[PDB]
């Protein structure tokens, strides 16, 4: 059924972000993060995240950063791989102005538009009951082959293409099949719009069944 396929795709997609959010919520309660605010040892913080990520590599964000009350105090260096500089990191932090939910952000980078889901959670100081700042996780959708692979496999379809309006952002194609991404855009092809906090974004997932 076409509707079954769309519902499955929607559920798999949501499940990926749910898995990351469970991690994000748990990590943000760590004394390691809280202590970083005072002692600012980046090697300790990076080694902490490195250990977690390697234990569950398929449910991890592309990059992380931390803010205090004034601005960014740390990032994991990975944002730069997506054309994001310090000024753009600053803007992301300001764009995600509320906690505990994924927001879809289309941001201009040094290499063009990048399309992300970004979430922030507060870092509580349990000595005072005040918030020290926020922890952010960013998922970069563009060229996210691992995500597309997961979407294709877990939905038992032949291939998937992610688009923003009309423009392809990512796909699962091997390169040897009788069709390419243009053929899929311009075989049973189903369109599943992506909903983020009940708003229909410009993002759509296209499944290909042969
Ligand atoms: Ni999963
Ligand atoms: Ni940097
Ligand atoms: Ni949903
Ligand atoms: Ni097939």
């Amino acid at each position: 059924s076409k509707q079954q396929t769309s519902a499955l795709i929607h559920n798999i997609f949501d499940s990926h972000f749910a898995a990351i959010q469970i991690h994000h919520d748990s990590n943000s309660k760590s004394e390691v993060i809280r202590d970083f605010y005072t002692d600012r040892d980046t090697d300790v913080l990076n080694f902490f995240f490195l250990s977690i990520d390697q234990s569950d590599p398929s449910h991890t964000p592309e990059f992380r950063f931390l803010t205090d009350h004034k601005g960014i105090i740390w990032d994991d260096g990975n944002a730069h791989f997506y054309g994001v500089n310090d000024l753009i990191l600053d803007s992301l932090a300001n764009r995600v102005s509320f906690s505990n939910n994924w927001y879809y952000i289309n941001v201009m980078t040094s290499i063009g538009s990048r399309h992300m889901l970004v979430r922030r959670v507060p870092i509580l100081d349990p000595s005072t009951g005040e918030v020290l700042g926020f922890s952010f996780n960013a998922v970069v959708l563009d060229n996210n082959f691992a995500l597309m692979e997961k979407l294709k496999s877990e939905s038992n379809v032949d291939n998937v293409v992610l688009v923003a309006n009309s423009v392809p952002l990512a796909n699962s194609l091997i390169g040897d099949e009788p069709y390419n991404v243009a053929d899929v855009l311009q075989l049973l092809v189903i369109e599943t719009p992506i909903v983020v906090n009940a708003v229909t974004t410009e993002l759509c997932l296209l499944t290909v069944q042969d």
Side-chain angles (χ1 to χ4, degrees):
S1 141
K2 290 152 139 198
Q3 288 312 289
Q4 282 185 312
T5 301
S6 281
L8 188 55
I9 262 285
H10 171 201
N11 293 339
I12 292 149
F13 185 88
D14 281 357
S15 282
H16 175 82
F17 292 90
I20 300 171
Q21 154 261 299
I22 288 158
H23 273 308
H24 193 195
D25 288 350
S26 173
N27 294 347
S28 300
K29 285 174 183 151
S30 169
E31 186 172 358
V32 178
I33 293 171
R34 181 191 322 141
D35 289 348
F36 180 80
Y37 279 79
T38 51
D39 291 298
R40 307 282 170 104
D41 190 329
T42 61
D43 290 346
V44 169
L45 189 60
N46 283 321
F47 193 47
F48 167 83
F49 285 125
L50 189 268
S51 306
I52 296 160
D53 288 352
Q54 286 169 350
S55 76
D56 185 19
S58 69
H59 306 94
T60 65
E62 276 63 55
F63 67 90
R64 297 184 172 94
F65 52 101
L66 287 175
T67 56
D68 63 4
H69 300 158
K70 291 106 126 204
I72 295 169
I73 62 166
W74 168 90
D75 68 272
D76 64 10
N78 290 329
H80 300 321
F81 286 87
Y82 307 93
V84 174
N85 65 1
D86 281 333
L87 198 275
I88 296 164
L89 274 175
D90 179 329
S91 163
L92 247 27
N94 292 314
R95 288 165 186 243
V96 185
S97 53
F98 301 107
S99 307
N100 308 321
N101 282 313
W102 291 103
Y103 292 106
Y104 170 58
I105 295 165
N106 185 339
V107 282
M108 181 60 58
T109 78
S110 63
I111 57 180
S113 292
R114 284 296 181 272
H115 307 257
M116 310 182 181
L117 265 67
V118 182
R119 192 173 176 262
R120 98 185 178 174
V121 298
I123 303 314
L124 204 47
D125 184 346
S127 75
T128 61
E130 313 284 10
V131 168
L132 294 169
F134 301 86
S135 168
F136 296 77
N137 279 14
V139 171
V140 181
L141 298 171
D142 311 76
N143 311 305
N144 199 317
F145 185 81
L147 188 58
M148 299 300 116
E149 265 309 294
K150 164 175 184 147
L151 279 169
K152 164 178 146 171
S153 294
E154 287 172 37
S155 67
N156 205 233
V157 299
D158 294 276
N159 267 312
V160 299
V161 179
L162 171 66
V163 297
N165 308 289
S166 68
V167 178
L169 304 187
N171 75 82
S172 67
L173 280 74
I174 286 155
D176 78 314
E177 47 280 278
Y179 54 93
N180 65 18
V181 170
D183 298 326
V184 182
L185 296 173
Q186 304 182 37
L187 293 197
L188 172 58
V189 178
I190 301 175
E191 288 183 22
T192 302
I194 297 166
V195 177
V196 182
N197 312 299
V199 194
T200 306
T201 67
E202 71 190 345
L203 298 168
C204 189
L205 236 18
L206 307 198
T207 49
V208 179
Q209 292 165 283
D210 60 11

